[PDB]
RNA sequence: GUCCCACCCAUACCCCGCCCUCAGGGUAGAAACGAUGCCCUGAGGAGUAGGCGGCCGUGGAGGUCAGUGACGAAGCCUAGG
RNA sequence: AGACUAAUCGAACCAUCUAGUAGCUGGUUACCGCCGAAGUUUCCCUCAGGAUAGCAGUGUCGACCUUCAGUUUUAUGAGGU
RNA sequence: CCGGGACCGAGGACCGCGCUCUGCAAGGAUGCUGGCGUAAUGGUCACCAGCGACCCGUCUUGAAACACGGACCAAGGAGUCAAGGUUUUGCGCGAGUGUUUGGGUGUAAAACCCGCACGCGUAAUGAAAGUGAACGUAGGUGAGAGCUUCGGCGCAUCAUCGA
RNA sequence: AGAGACCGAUAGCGCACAAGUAGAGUGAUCGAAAGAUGAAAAGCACUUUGAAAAGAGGGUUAAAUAGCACGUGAAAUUGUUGAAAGGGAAGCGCUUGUGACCAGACUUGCGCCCGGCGGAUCAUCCGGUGUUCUCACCGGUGCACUCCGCCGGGCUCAGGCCA
């Protein structure tokens, strides 16, 4: 007897990405090179983040970007490991170095409008092969539908699981004291 | 571009036509695929620089690949017979392989298979008749 | 695909992965929504709090054609007009001419005001319009003019 | 030809695992199976009754999967497959499918003998 | 008789389908590995001077 | 009843060999690799109800081995391997 | 006499509704590997049964913050066996 | 500091730490010699011998039970399908997305092409008439990966005070 | 009338066959089992034993190990022959012994030297061709001490099992 509590424990992070794409793959091939032979962590929090799923890696906007491109950050290289999207409300757009997994055809096309250049992961680590003179970006994780019903229960103002919305629907008996009680 | 020798390998690296896989091992009978194993560093048809080898009526026959050339198949081989002596085809593929880095790291495989096929071109002994042990007091009668 | 679920799992293997003691009955507890206020109660007031009860005056005979009228903020009102024409406007070149945009050609009925707005002038035709959008287009140099 | 050199090879077990009660019944195979009872006294280890299979019984990884000679079988069907076996032929042994005729067999065996293939079942 | 025979898939991924594979009739190494006999060939895009 | 020597054996403790699981490292100006591979180091292994992973068989469908076969396919018997 | 009405009577026989419902008995089909319980809280014409919390598994993400502890010490409060 | 006995030999060019330093007992066994080359070593099956060993499945706190089912063999034999939800994994497009009710065409129940409407999403809140989201570089404070001209800038998220 | 990622004689309609038939009930009604010799009957002339049925011969056929109880012919259960055990059960696990039977490995390879024999040109050179554009091939030139096989002798090295 060894009198242990706990044995034969897993890793709870992933390890490699279980999406099959070839193409993503060699980009693995990459950058685990990169880092084994590299002192930037820069290049381990990439790699990192290449293994995640869809819903860890919300997509960011142009807008987000032009929040970040103030106060003296107007000459570094933008970093997302995501999808980028065009904003509609944004009418002029500035300048700037893109390095993203992939575009849309019109965030594309009003980047090079502007006068700006959209690169690739790989031409990124052709260039800046520690990553100086960069910022990453993440996008908004809580932002999705499904969370807002996450730990639903009284007086948490949470959402409900509703077939529909209007008078007839939930209200009445827990919701206003005129008919018992209030949550 | 898009394609590459990587990729090519990633597209059949799990399943192709030359692919031979049972129990306690897996083949590949592929021209040209040297010890005929299926991996990256031997697969013939998917590297740019490749070799093979094959069996002549009296010796070596030896195929290279044309890189200039990879979209035309027709022309796309560079073959070469030797019939002359073991040690001068020796002699030939080593430097064929290892003088102008074309492959350098299949400079043993190549000789090890010339020296296989010209073993195996020669006249055969005859074996041994065979023994009785326990069948021969049967056979007494 | 029924090559790969968890009941080809489970041959062999006695109860099927239901349990000894309780061993998976007809219909344990009732059908459907029965024991709402005797014995579903708990999980009905920790989720679903408001199923029972009445609330607010009917309605008989609705027709909910009365009661269309989408609406639009005003900061996407610049996305009517087509792109090229709209990067001339936002450039800056013409200085000297007015875009009117027709709302209910493009299926909407009230302008809401909600983000902010460039200083060029433009014409708002709508059925109704807030009063901060009133303001907004009017500090622009616009003008909004009700159209029905 | 004699094979490489290599370890000693041990079994560590012999016999077959038989399934527990399959001596004395005639519908039973003698398959291993897993008890699964509640009080079975082999699920529960019991002094004096059958060993249950375990991952421990396992063989060495370098001489796994060879047989007491020191090749490994490898199974074909005509003659264009046993040329396969060029660069094999002090690790691998060929093994002739059991529904190949007689004639292609003769013809099998003439071929491995050239190329020095060690053959299983070749006296027929 | 009523279980779900036919799939609905949509028409951009169709498409994104059949350029791949277009893209993919390119290349001579994957027509030996499907299993063709092309060894003697002149142009991997095999064209014809409209002879037909 | 009390005290003192020697000796016997558990799936327990110590050392060594082997299997698996988990964890930590090395491997491209590629003479390179089933990179899902190989090499080095350490610890652990009991289990009903139950959860997950990997693999083995049966009837059919697409592709491929230019696969086997009346010189005998499939099936069946066999203290023969 | 609750007797008899085709070996059937305290409500005949044949087909259909009908695969009638069951909180109740019985059964539930190949292998290996890793983890591993509960009979307890609250409500119910509830007590051979359910919902709810607890115990368990799997999938992860953010740290690698250094963070924590069914433990000891020092200082300082409460108790009525 | 000198004797006696038992079990074991993993690894496979050199590299290291050291010593008594033409070398060695220092990061894992080599040297010499004998008999036999076949049933000799080894493996399968049957039997005698030493020790061990209660009948399976099931309900149960407790089953070898004086608790129930099972004479024997062959074939059949039990978590499926549809609609509607939900979370998670892969894929396409992205402020939009969905061709197939329908039309055109065809080597014809396949494949390919087309569009007006429509569904969900982009705005909520009240029983209702109704109204309808910027004081600030879209705010302040404490933590935060990463980057940096070394001063600082500070994603995601958590907490808190405001609009 | 045309089709199928459907079933394949305990399946698929109750019915692949003289099936809503045979059969049961006074009646309304209930309702089965059962496919396959061989390419062609060429379906065994005749002799003998026997009352007969049958047997033994002899015939047809690629086959009668296909004979109208007919393709292939599994298990429960039974007969003969061969081997073995048994003082109120048998079966089973670990480890030797005896008896029957048996798979592997082994039977040499490599190199060097000396001699014999048959040879047929090795290096070199120049002409042409290909190519990774600097290496190769082909055309001719060589001349015994080069190269290349065969045999006999010798030598070294390593190779089965048990100690
Ligand atoms: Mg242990
Ligand atoms: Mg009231
Ligand atoms: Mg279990
Ligand atoms: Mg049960
Ligand atoms: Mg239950
Ligand atoms: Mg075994
Ligand atoms: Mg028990
Ligand atoms: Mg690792
Ligand atoms: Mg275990
Ligand atoms: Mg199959
Ligand atoms: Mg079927
Ligand atoms: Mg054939
Ligand atoms: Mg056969
Ligand atoms: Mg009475
Ligand atoms: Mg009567
Ligand atoms: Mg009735
Ligand atoms: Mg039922
Ligand atoms: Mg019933
Ligand atoms: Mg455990
Ligand atoms: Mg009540
Ligand atoms: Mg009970
Ligand atoms: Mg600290
Ligand atoms: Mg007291
Ligand atoms: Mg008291
Ligand atoms: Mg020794
Ligand atoms: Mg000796
Ligand atoms: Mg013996
Ligand atoms: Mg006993
Ligand atoms: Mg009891
Ligand atoms: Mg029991
Ligand atoms: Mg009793
Ligand atoms: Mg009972
Ligand atoms: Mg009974
Ligand atoms: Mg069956
Ligand atoms: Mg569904
Ligand atoms: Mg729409
Ligand atoms: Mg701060
Ligand atoms: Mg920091
Ligand atoms: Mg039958
Ligand atoms: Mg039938
Ligand atoms: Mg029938
Ligand atoms: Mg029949
Ligand atoms: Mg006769
Ligand atoms: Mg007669
Ligand atoms: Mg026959
Ligand atoms: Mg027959
Ligand atoms: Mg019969
Ligand atoms: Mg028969
Ligand atoms: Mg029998
Ligand atoms: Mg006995
Ligand atoms: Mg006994
Ligand atoms: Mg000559
Ligand atoms: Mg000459
Ligand atoms: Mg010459
Ligand atoms: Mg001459």
């Not at chain 1, 242990?4 to 890793?11: A, E, M």
């Not at chain 4, 090879?9 to 398959?31: E, G, N, P, W, Y």
Request: proline content about 5%; hydrophobic content about 35%; aromatic content about 6%.
């Amino acid at each position: 007897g060894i009198d242990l509590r706990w044995k034969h424990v897993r890793s709870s992070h992933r390890k490699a990405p279980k999406s099959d794409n070839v193409y993503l793959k060699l980009l693995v091939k990459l950058y685990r090179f990169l880092a084994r032979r590299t002192e930037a962590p820069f290049n381990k929090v990439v790699l990192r983040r290449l293994f995640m799923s869809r819903i860890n890696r919300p997509p960011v906007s142009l807008s987000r970007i032009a929040r970040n491109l103030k106060n003296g950050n107007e000459k570094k290289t933008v970093v997302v490991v995501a999808t980028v999207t065009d904003d509609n409300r944004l009418l002029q757009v500035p300048k700037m170095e893109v390095a993203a997994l992939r575009f849309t055809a019109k965030a594309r096309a009003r980047i090079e409008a502007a006068g700006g250049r959209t690169l690739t992961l790989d031409q990124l680590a052709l260039e800046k092969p520690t990553g100086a003179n960069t910022l990453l970006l993440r996008g908004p994780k809580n932002a999705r539908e499904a969370v807002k019903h996450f730990g639903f229960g009284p007086h948490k103002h949470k959402k409900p699981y509703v077939r529909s919305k209007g008078r007839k629907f939930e209200r009445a008996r827990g919701r206003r004291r005129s008919r018992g009680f209030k949550v | 571009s898009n394609v590459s020798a990587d990729l090519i390998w990633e597209v059949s690296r799990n399943y192709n036509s030359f692919l031979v896989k049972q129990r306690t091992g897996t083949f590949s009978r592929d021209a040209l695929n040297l010890t005929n194993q299926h991996s990256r560093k031997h697969a013939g048809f998917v590297n740019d620089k490749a070799l093979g080898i094959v069996p002549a009526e009296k010796g070596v026959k030896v195929i290279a690949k044309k890189v200039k050339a990879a979209n035309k198949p027709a022309s796309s081989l560079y073959t070469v017979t030797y019939k002359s002596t073991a040690r001068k085809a020796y002699k030939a593929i080593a430097s064929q392989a290892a003088k102008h880095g074309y492959r350098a790291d299949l400079r043993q495989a190549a000789v090890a298979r010339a020296s296989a096929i010209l073993r195996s071109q020669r006249p055969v002994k005859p074996e041994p008749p065979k023994k009785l042990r326990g069948a021969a007091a049967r056979r007494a009668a | 695909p029924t090559r790969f679920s968890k009941t080809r799992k489970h041959r062999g293997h006695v109860s099927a992965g239901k349990g000894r003691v309780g061993k998976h009955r007809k219909h344990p507890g009732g059908r459907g929504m029965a024991g709402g206020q005797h014995h579903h109660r708990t999980n009905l007031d920790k989720y679903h709090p408001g199923y029972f009860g009445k609330v607010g005056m009917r309605h008989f005979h609705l027709l909910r054609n009365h009661y269309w009228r989408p609406s639009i903020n005003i900061d996407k009102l610049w996305s009517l007009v087509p792109s090229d024409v709209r990067e001339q406007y936002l450039s800056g070149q013409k200085k000297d001419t007015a875009p009117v945009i027709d709302l209910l050609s493009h299926g909407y009925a009230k302008l809401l005001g909600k983000g902010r707005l460039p200083e060029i002038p433009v014409v708002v035709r709508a059925r109704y319009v807030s009063a901060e959008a009133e303001r907004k287009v009017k500090e622009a140099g616009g003008v909004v003019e009700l159209v029905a | 030809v004699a094979a490489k050199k290599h370890v000693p090879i041990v079994k560590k077990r012999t016999k077959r695992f038989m399934r527990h009660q399959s001596d004395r019944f005639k519908c039973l195979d003698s398959a291993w199976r897993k008890p699964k009872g509640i009080d079975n006294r082999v699920r529960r280890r019991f002094k004096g009754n059958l060993a249950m299979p375990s991952i421990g019984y396992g063989s060495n990884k370098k001489t796994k999967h060879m047989m007491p000679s020191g090749h490994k079988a490898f199974l074909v069907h005509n003659v264009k497959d046993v040329e396969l076996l060029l660069m094999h032929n002090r690790t691998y042994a060929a093994e002739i499918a059991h529904n190949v005729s007689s004639r292609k067999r003769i013809d099998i065996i003439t071929r491995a003998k050239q190329l020095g293939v060690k053959v299983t079942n070749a006296k027929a | 008789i009523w279980r779900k025979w036919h799939v609905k898939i949509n028409q951009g991924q169709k498409r994104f389908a059949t350029a791949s594979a277009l893209a993919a009739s390119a290349v001579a190494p994957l027509l030996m590995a499907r299993g063709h006999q092309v060894s003697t060939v002149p142009e991997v895009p095999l064209v014809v001077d409209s002879a037909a």
